[model samples]
Target: HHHWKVLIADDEAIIREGIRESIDWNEFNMEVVAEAEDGEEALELALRHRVDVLFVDLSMPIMDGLTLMKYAREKLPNCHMIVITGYDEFSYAQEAIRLQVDDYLLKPTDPQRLREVVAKVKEKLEQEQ
Candidate 1:
């Protein structure tokens, strides 16, 4: 099995844990390498670690998801960006796209669907080879 490292940034620990427990990470060949309560910290950790993907929330403190995406794109061009926003912010979808996010997920997400997304992420990472 492949081991994929992910960096997660969200102000809420619950949201972070939800993502951690919501999926059989190892089953999907994924792991949470680090987590941040705010966007800036996440970016810092991403720069220092071997992260394969970045899971960011839009309304975070210090820095928001879109801004992080913009920075991450230039700073870590090869690291994948996955934006997860609240269900009501469908409006931000286009904004995320503009920032070059690899995928967008709705809040209050279904566990099964998150797994499928991670599976797709694994495939996409493979394609990078």
Candidate 2:
């Protein structure tokens, strides 16, 4: 079984901490390889780590989630993207769909929801492998 690489990007420290602490990532055969407080940093780390999965927030500084996702889509191709954002705007969601995001989640995400998404992605990755 592969230990999938994960990246979490959110501006708020508390948000990042909450996501990191909430999940038992090892149970899903995944590890968080990096965390970033801005979209620019997130993209940089994602590229550096060659992340298998990305959890990104929308309104980050220097770059935005969609912009980063666009770059990731081209550069990482196979990397899975999950959007975690406070914005409930249709435009954002529409754009995320256009980018082919694996999932889109709201902020203050329920642990159960997060786990379900992770499990689903894990299955997909395994199939691809």
Cα lDDT tens digits, model 2, 1-129, are: 668999999889998988888899999899999999999999999999999999988778999888889998899999999888785553566678877788877888789988988998899888988
The prediction achieving the highest TM-score against the true structure is 2
Candidate lDDT scores, in order, read: 0.82, 0.88
TM-score of each: 0.91, 0.94
Residues 1-129, candidate 1, lDDT per residue (tens digit)? 468789888778988888887887888677888999988898888888858898988877988777888888888888788888887776876887866677778876789878877888888888887
Among all windows of 10 consecutive residues in model 1, the one with the lowest summed lDDT is 93-102
Candidate 1: clashing pairs of residues: none
Candidates in order: C-alpha RMSD to true structure: 1.6, 1.3
